[PDB]
Amino acid sequence: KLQASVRCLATHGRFLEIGKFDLSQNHPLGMAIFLKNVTFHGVLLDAF
């Protein structure tokens, strides 16, 4: 699901990841998505 949603992005898109499963398991994320200007966000509310 996480890989599929990344393919939905447009140029100048922003990806807000709030789920903590793939991040914890440290799954790979191909950097080719960033040729399209894309901002990848790791959003955790606990930091506040």
- Shortest Å distance, C-beta 7 to ligand NDP: 19
DSSP result, the chain: -HHHHHTT--TTEEEEE---HHHHHT----GGGGSS-EEEEE--STT-
35 counts as binding its own copies under rule CB under 8 A: yes
> Nearest residue by C-beta to ligand NDP?
45
Q: Does 23 bind its own copies (CB under 8 A)?
A: yes
The Cα 29–Cα 35 span in angstroms is: 14
Which residues bind to its own copies, rule: CB under 8 A? Answer: 7, 11-12, 17, 20, 22-44, 47
